Chain A
Amino acid sequence: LVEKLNGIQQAEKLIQGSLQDVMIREIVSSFKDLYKSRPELHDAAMQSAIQG
């Protein structure tokens, strides 16, 4: 039973790892698309840097 619980814990850990990995990959790709698509984000980032 102990070895079973070690295995299931490791599986859960790797599950959540891969989950957050892909969640970041996809959010990043979505932003890389939306930025290059939309004109507004360019001047928004300009203003953001200026006020920063």
Chain B
Amino acid sequence: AKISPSEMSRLLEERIAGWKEVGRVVSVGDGIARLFGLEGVQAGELVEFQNGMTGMALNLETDNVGVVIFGDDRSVLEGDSVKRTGRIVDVPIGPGLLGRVVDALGNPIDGKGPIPAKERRRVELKAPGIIPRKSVHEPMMTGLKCVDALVPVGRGQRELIIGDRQTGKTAVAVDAIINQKEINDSTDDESKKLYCIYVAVGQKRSTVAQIVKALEQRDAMKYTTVVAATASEAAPLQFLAPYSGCAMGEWFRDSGRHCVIIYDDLSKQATAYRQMSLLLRRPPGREAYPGDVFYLHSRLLERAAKMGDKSGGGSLTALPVIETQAGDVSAYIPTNVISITDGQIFLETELFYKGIRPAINVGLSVSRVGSAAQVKAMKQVAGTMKLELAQYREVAAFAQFGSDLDASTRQLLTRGTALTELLKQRQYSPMKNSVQVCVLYCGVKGYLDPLDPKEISRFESLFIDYINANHQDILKTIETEKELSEKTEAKLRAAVDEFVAMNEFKK
């Protein structure tokens, strides 16, 4: 720091000395300007008008230049002077973003203070190449059960969350965010803390405020940031927000830390790109989209990566979100993102209303990484679980017709129903990995087959309270060793036996 009179005034006095290109707007319409001049413009650079509004130059035609505006076009008047700053569009990075809400360009909208960050980063960047990478070996604890068991997620992955409207997409992401506060509070190792970024494209400010409220109510903002490019926000801001999020996440990825980024309504980005190109008179493709949509999403998703031990060892996981219409995944955007993602998490309304919540279809849903992003203790249970659920899914359709079956098949149906009733969860109620392991142990070793299906929802909670009270040591041992030795196996079985003795259910 420094003192005002003797230093700052001298500095400004030394600063004031100075003396001795520009263009003019030619056409204006629909949040877009066409200028004449500025022959020394970089394609993609920031531009400043004579009223404070900003813009981005995209079409460097021969006669004119095509700029997209970050706001309303009432300020531009077909003749206003325009000046280029020379900066490519960039955003601040650092821990000053944690706990804050910002627009597509890093300008805060929380209403509490400016952004204390000194280092910036370019929005559109080259992804990291083949050599500075490694395989995915660490898990990303989502807090859910069916995800963490059957569709695991690693640190460095790019897993899609695809479904219909009102199916639990944001809720899945919010539980993924909420599960991390324990992991972060119970350490000071930044290599182990998981920071989070939530980009919201097309959402309404009421929804974003509800999300911020749900996170503040659970202390889940000191390790997150939010990037709100809502519907009133212009098309270029909606189109730029996810690249800004990836720029904010590359600081973690490169600085040895970890991160997760959730693009919410990733189809509104493509809508905005269509809008921009069609108002820039670019010709469309199919569904009126351009052909550069693949190169629009590939640039973005290839920034998620797991770096090597020479580049710090960081990671940036990605969890894009997509809304389909009538379950049509034969469309263009779903097809592109499935062809450029490391997995899928499908969500259905039939399963959402049948009683399965989260309504994850574990057949279509996959994760190419798979067990490598899974703990051994969870592998042991989840292999059997996947096998049993495959069998149940095969057999239940024929079983429902009232036929009479043997015991080897009745056991399949019973175990499948038990697991299907176990994997249900309330919203904003995530669980630790050790507790998931214990619950799925109870479900897999047959301590729920005779029990009634409707009673499992309270079996689960009572067992959770029981093991949290009297058998925390088993949980700590599983959390540390990350496996199930015979000792922990026996201790857990004994705890379950004590619980079933102490308690009584309808069967």
Q: Footprint of B on A, CB under 8 Å?
A: 9, 12-13, 16, 19-20, 23, 52
Contact = CB atoms under 8 A, between A and B. Distances in A.
A16 B8 contact: yes
A4 B329 CA distance: 56
A16 B19 contact: no
B64 to A, nearest CB: 34
B19 A52 contact: yes
B299 to A, nearest CB: 38
A13 B20 CA distance: 34
The dominant DSSP class at the B interface is loop
B469 interface: no
Contacts of A16: 1, 4, 8
Contacts of A20: 4, 8
Nearest to A13: B1
A7 B83 CA distance: 40
A43 B175 CA distance: 71
B97 to A, nearest CB: 17
Nearest to B12: A20
Contacts of A52: 19-20
Q: Most chain-B CB neighbours within 10 Å: which of A9, A12, A23, A52?
A: A23
A12 B1 CA distance: 9
Contacts of A12: 1
B7 to A, nearest CB: 10
The dominant DSSP class at the A interface is helix
B1 A19 contact: no
- List 5 A-B pairs, minimum CB-CB distance, nearest first: A19-B4, A16-B4, A52-B19, A20-B8, A12-B1
B244 to A, nearest CB: 26
12 contacts: A9-B1, A12-B1, A13-B1, A16-B1, A16-B4, A16-B8, A19-B4, A20-B4, A20-B8, A23-B4, A52-B19, A52-B20
Contacts of B19: 52
A23 B20 CA distance: 27
Interface string B279-305: 000000000000000000000000000
Contacts of B4: 16, 19-20, 23
B139 to A, nearest CB: 33
Contacts of A19: 4
A9 B1 CA distance: 9
Given A16-B1, A19-B4, A20-B8, 9 more contacts: A9-B1, A12-B1, A13-B1, A16-B4, A16-B8, A20-B4, A23-B4, A52-B19, A52-B20
Interface string B1-40: 1001000100000000001100000000000000000000
Contacts of B20: 52
A13 B8 CA distance: 13
A25 to B, nearest CB: 14
Nearest to B19: A52
A19 B19 CA distance: 27
A52 B8 CA distance: 28
A17 B19 CA distance: 27
A11 B8 CA distance: 18
Contacts of B1: 9, 12-13, 16
B276 to A, nearest CB: 38
Nearest to A9: B1
A7 to B, nearest CB: 14
Interface in B136-184: none
B369 to A, nearest CB: 40
A20 B19 CA distance: 24
A19 B8 CA distance: 11
B113 to A, nearest CB: 10
Nearest to B1: A12
A52 B4 CA distance: 32
A23 B4 CA distance: 10
A39 B19 CA distance: 24
Nearest to B8: A20
A16 B20 CA distance: 31
Nearest to A24: B12
A9 B4 CA distance: 15
Nearest to A19: B4
A41 B465 CA distance: 83
Contacts of A9: 1
A21 B20 CA distance: 27
A13 B489 CA distance: 58
B35 to A, nearest CB: 29
A5 B4 CA distance: 20
A19 B20 CA distance: 30
B348 to A, nearest CB: 49
A43 B8 CA distance: 32
B383 to A, nearest CB: 48
A29 to B, nearest CB: 17
Nearest to A12: B1
